[PDB]
């Protein structure tokens, strides 16, 4: 075991979640940020 599925677990989910956040944050942050910098930069 339990001890390998808990832990197996809160990793899986913890270290998948800070790939969401990473990916989620550049595409967002990074997709949506680097857009405003073309359209606040160009605008602005």
């Not at 270290?15 to 073309?38: N, P, Q, R, S």
């Amino acid at each position: 075991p339990a001890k390998a599925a808990f832990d197996s677990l809160q990793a899986s989910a913890t270290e998948m979640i800070g790939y969401a956040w990473a990916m989620v944050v550049v595409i967002v942050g990074a997709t949506i940020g680097i857009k405003l910098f073309k359209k606040f930069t160009s605008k602005a």
